[PDB]
Amino acid sequence: HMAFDLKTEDGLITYLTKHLSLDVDTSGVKRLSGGFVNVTWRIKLNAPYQGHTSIILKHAQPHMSTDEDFKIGVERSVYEYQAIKLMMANREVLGGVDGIVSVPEGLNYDLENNALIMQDVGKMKTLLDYVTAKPPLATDIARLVGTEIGGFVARLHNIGRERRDDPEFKFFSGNIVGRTTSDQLYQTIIPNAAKYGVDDPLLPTVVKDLVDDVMHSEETLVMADLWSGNILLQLEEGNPSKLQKIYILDWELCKYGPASLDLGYFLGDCYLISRFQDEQVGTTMRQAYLQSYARTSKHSINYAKVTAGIAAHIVMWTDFMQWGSEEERINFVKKGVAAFHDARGNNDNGEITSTLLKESSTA
Ligand SMILES: [Cl-]
Ligand SMILES: [Cl-]
Ligand SMILES: [Cl-]
């Protein structure tokens, strides 16, 4: 077994040709990222590999971090890689009848040389990019995105209940690193309020409940990072008016947890878009999602828990996104903190809960 140098272009082509037998363009290679630990290469092949002529390779360098940090990084990789393999295997029952939602295929993961190979998607723009541009994303396209992601996420949650005990599914229940990241995120709720003048003494309790659910729930399988910054859109190469594919990119946090976590992320992000970008794009998208999610899911939504999930997203993300002005952001977070009182009080005239019911109505 040879030691290879994946930090140089020449060592890259040795690894690809000598170890994996790939026919590599010596001039189809470009570095994308690179610090002390990680490197990302974009690569063009002269002959296909698992159907693909272009791929990316990521590489962690050992001995450039503590032993503890390097170990957790590898764990994150494996869950990301294995999550993507699970969706490739369940492509048929998830990607639906005529559906366009998909995951960038994972091709190879070499734990000996710390080298992961994935499908190269292209230089596609995120959803987040399309909804912040002036002008914004056509509304016909926003409806379809909502309808497709709702149906994917519902099919995901359905299969995760019925295959809960199969061992490849239980593997993700054990993604403790992934559950801990969720926890750390929920801990910023009280700081982010405090910073904006809000200081409600309910928040301790609400945080406690969110943290326990995420550390202990085994309800279903959740994508766990379903916001617009982690979603790519492939538009027709020419007509900017026809959607071809939606890709969900980062699956590191995939795990067992409550269904409401996925609804909170995405509906939450819709609320942010409605308020600070385009009301019709954010609102179409929200409603389309709720419409298809409610038709496909084999369990009823819990409106209190989704209301609180949305509140959580609002308080955790308003500052990060850095939209509008200080003053407006303060009042938006205040509406979030208000929505926690509506969840705990089971109040169906609450501003958020009430909307949820209307937009997910059947007839
Ligand atoms: Cl390809
Ligand atoms: Cl396991
Ligand atoms: Cl702005």
Residue numbers in the entry: 0 to 362
What did the publication describing this PDB structure actually write?
Psilocybin, the natural hallucinogen from Psilocybe (magic) mushrooms, is a highly promising drug candidate for the treatment of depression and several other mental health conditions. The third of these, ATP‐dependent phosphorylation of the intermediate 4‐hydroxytryptamine, is catalysed by PsiK.
Here we present a crystallographic analysis and a structure‐based mutagenesis study of this kinase, providing insight into its mode of substrate recognition. The results of our work will support future bioengineering efforts aimed at generating variants of psilocybin with enhanced therapeutic properties.
